[PDB]
Amino acid sequence: GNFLKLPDTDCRQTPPFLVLLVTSSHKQLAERMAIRQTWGKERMVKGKQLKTFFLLGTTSSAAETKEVDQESQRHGDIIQKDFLDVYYNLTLKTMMGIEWVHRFCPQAAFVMKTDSDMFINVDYLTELLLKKNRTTRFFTGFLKLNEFPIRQPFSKWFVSKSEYPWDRYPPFCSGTGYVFSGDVASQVYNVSKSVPYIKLEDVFVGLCLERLNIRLEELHSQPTFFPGGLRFSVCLFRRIVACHFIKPRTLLDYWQALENSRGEDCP
Ligand SMILES: OC[C@H]1O[C@@H](O[C@@H]2[C@H](O)[C@@H](OC[C@H]3O[C@@H](O)[C@@H](O)[C@@H](O)[C@@H]3O)O[C@H](CO)[C@H]2O)[C@H](O)[C@@H](O)[C@H]1O
Ligand SMILES: *[C@@H]1O[C@H](CO)[C@@H](O[C@@H]2O[C@H](CO)[C@@H](O)[C@H](O)[C@H]2NC(C)=O)[C@H](O)[C@H]1NC(C)=O
Numbered sequence: 001g002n003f004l005k006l007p008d009t010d011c012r013q014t015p016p017f018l019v020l021l022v023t024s025s026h027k028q029l030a031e032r033m034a035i036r037q038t039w040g041k042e043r044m045v046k047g048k049q050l051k052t053f054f055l056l057g058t059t060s061s062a063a064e065t066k067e068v069d070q071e072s073q074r075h076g077d078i079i080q081k082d083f084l085d086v087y088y089n090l091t092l093k094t095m096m097g098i099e100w101v102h103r104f105c106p107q108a109a110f111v112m113k114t115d116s117d118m119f120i121n122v123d124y125l126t127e128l129l130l131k132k133n134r135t136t137r138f139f140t141g142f143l144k145l146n147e148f149p150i151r152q153p154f155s156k157w158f159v160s161k162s163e164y165p166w167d168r169y170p171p172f173c174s175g176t177g178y179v180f181s182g183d184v185a186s187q188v189y190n191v192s193k194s195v196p197y198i199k200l201e202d203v204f205v206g207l208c209l210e211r212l213n214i215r216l217e218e219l220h221s222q223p224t225f226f227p228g229g230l231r232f233s234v235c236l237f238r239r240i241v242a243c244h245f246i247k248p249r250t251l252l253d254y255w256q257a258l259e260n261s262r263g264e265d266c267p
């Protein structure tokens, strides 16, 4: 698949239950390290295998390139392809991750694509996934069902009419963090080249799911994905899946809080 870097992992030998694909830019080593030290640490979660990989492209900067080659050598958990890693190539990045699942890890029961400034509660997500009994053509997160493209030309999410010419976006899930059964990766990759491109990755995946007739569903009767962020409490964070707007220091403090308070009960 023209991959420059691949993780040493055999999904055939050890079918992972949950694969996390974390998008971050080259300079966000602090983010990736905070994640490797917290929700990204690989482990058995109720006897299910959790794997974590970081999605990177390439950069002009020779310094950053070397940093990243060193990071890959030292951690063996980077997935890389040769595309200029910038905000407006995030769709390539996402399709890279999806391609990886399709070519090298089709045995993953579930896959989560997430941002770097996130708290992810893998234990509770594992619990909700086992409860859901939806093992194929499954896709969830924070549902965005009737979104209008941003036409303000200076907004970070601006798309012109020629980039996306219709009034509404298909249904999609916030790219802060979305989860799908592993089969979905193959289907999305298969259709990706026949779907109109758009530089917003979560919208693009929504276009593919719509072409595949894969409908978005809520993970649980209570909201569990929070792109807007949350006021922190140990008891709320024990009963959510994902929370955005979390910088590395904060991520570590919250992780420490959840450790310090383990074993205490919450109403
Ligand atoms: O490469 C794409 C990039 O997209 C990011 O998602 C974007 C947001 O989901 C969305 O937010 C616009 C706006 O929508 C309102 O309904 C409210 O929910 C408000 O809070 C929100 O800010 O904007 C665009 C579509 O216009 C989406 O792409 C995503 O978070 C990134 O990780 C990345 O995937
Ligand atoms: C997305 O990545 C592609 C691949 O890296 C970029 O395309 C290249 O851009 C460089 C400029 O940095 C050119 O020298 C190459 O000729 C281009 N090649 C190809 C195959 O595209 C593309 O520019 C990136 N997208 C954005 C918006 O920067």
Ligand SMILES: *[C@@H]1O[C@H](CO[C@@H]2O[C@@H](C)[C@@H](O)[C@@H](O)[C@@H]2O)[C@@H](O)[C@H](O)[C@H]1NC(C)=O
Residues within 6 Å of the ligand: 131, 132, 133
């Ligand atoms: C997932 O499946 C669970 C299985 O429990 C037993 O088997 C299923 C097929 C039903 O017959 C159920 O009534 C049995 O107790 C269910 O308990 C569980 O409710 C299912 N998940 C959801 C979200 O409903």
Ligand SMILES: [Mn+2]
Residues within 6 Å of the ligand: 115, 116, 117, 244, 245
């Ligand atoms: Mn973010």
